[PDB]
Amino acid sequence: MLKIQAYFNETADLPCQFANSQNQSLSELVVFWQDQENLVLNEVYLGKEKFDSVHSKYMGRTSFDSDSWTLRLHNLQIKDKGLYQCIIHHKKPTGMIRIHQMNSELSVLA
Amino acid sequence: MLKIQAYFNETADLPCQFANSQNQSLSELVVFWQDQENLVLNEVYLGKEKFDSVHSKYMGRTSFDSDSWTLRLHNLQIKDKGLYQCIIHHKKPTGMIRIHQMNSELSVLA
């Protein structure tokens, strides 16, 4: 578990650290970022940013870099502290299978 | 390694994260904060801030929180990005013994 210390009103950059050794198209992956309550901050559904699974309280607050595989959460509040998870799935004909995950613990200092 | 993400012209909190399970006093300890070149930002020697070993580069720029045993590095510059170490020693009749270390990576963003 990676630990990140960030600051109130500023930003957190959370990473997935994914090597794509499996080596496939982002159009073949479902990537999302989940909080400790399993609510979704951000989803990249087969290469397309999606807001269908995103909790309304996270709307507008995040940005996913498809280069670094990193999520930026902006305008941090004390409440934003806790465990975050990056989960990466391969899309199959009938479902999807988890192929990677990375957890970060965030502190938000005053 | 704690990842600290803080901003230009702001202040970074460089923590020791030391439980102090033996309820020891600063007055029997020597605490150093050093950078990746092993240069010293500040020293608390048996409870007293001491600048004998502090590099010119850090003079005037630090403050110690004797409540949480954290050093704050003020008015951050991009140059300030890097590795930092809190190192706690217990003073012996001759010399001192290392009893705790906490390493942190500072990023400075804009």
UniProtKB/Swiss-Prot annotation, chains A, B:
Localization per record: Cell membrane
Ranges of residues in domain Ig-like V-type: 9-107
Keywords: Adaptive immunity, Cell membrane, Disulfide bond, Glycoprotein, Host cell receptor for virus entry, Host-virus interaction, Immunity, Immunoglobulin domain, Membrane, Receptor, Signal, Transmembrane, Transmembrane helix, Ubl conjugation
GO (cellular component) term, any one: centriolar satellite
A molecular-function term among this protein's GO annotations: receptor ligand activity
Annotated GO biological process: adaptive immune response; B cell activation; cell surface receptor signaling pathway; cellular response to lipopolysaccharide; immune response; negative regulation of T cell proliferation; positive regulation of cell population proliferation; positive regulation of DNA-templated transcription
Record's function text: Receptor involved in the costimulatory signal essential for T-lymphocyte proliferation and interleukin-2 production, by binding CD28 or CTLA-4. May play a critical role in the early events of T-cell activation and costimulation of naive T-cells, such as deciding between immunity and anergy that is made by T-cells within 24 hours after activation. Also involved in the regulation of B cells function, plays a role in regulating the level of IgG(1) produced. Upon CD40 engagement, activates NF-kappa-B signaling pathway via phospholipase C and protein kinase C activation. (Microbial infection) Acts as a receptor for adenovirus subgroup B.
Tissue specificity as recorded in UniProt: Expressed by activated B-lymphocytes and monocytes.
Full protein stretch here: 26 to 134 of 329
Presence of the UniProt keyword Transmembrane in the record: yes
UniProt PTM: Polyubiquitinated; which is promoted by MARCH8 and results in endocytosis and lysosomal degradation.
Disulfide bonds: C16-C86
Domain of life: Eukaryota
Lineage: Eukaryota, Metazoa, Chordata, Craniata, Vertebrata
SUBUNIT field: Homodimer. Interacts with MARCH8. Interacts (via cytoplasmic domain) with PHB1 and PHB2; the interactions increases after priming with CD40. Interacts with CD28. (Microbial infection) Interacts with adenovirus subgroup b fiber protein.
Residues modified by glycosylation: N9, N23
Entry protein name: T-lymphocyte activation antigen CD86
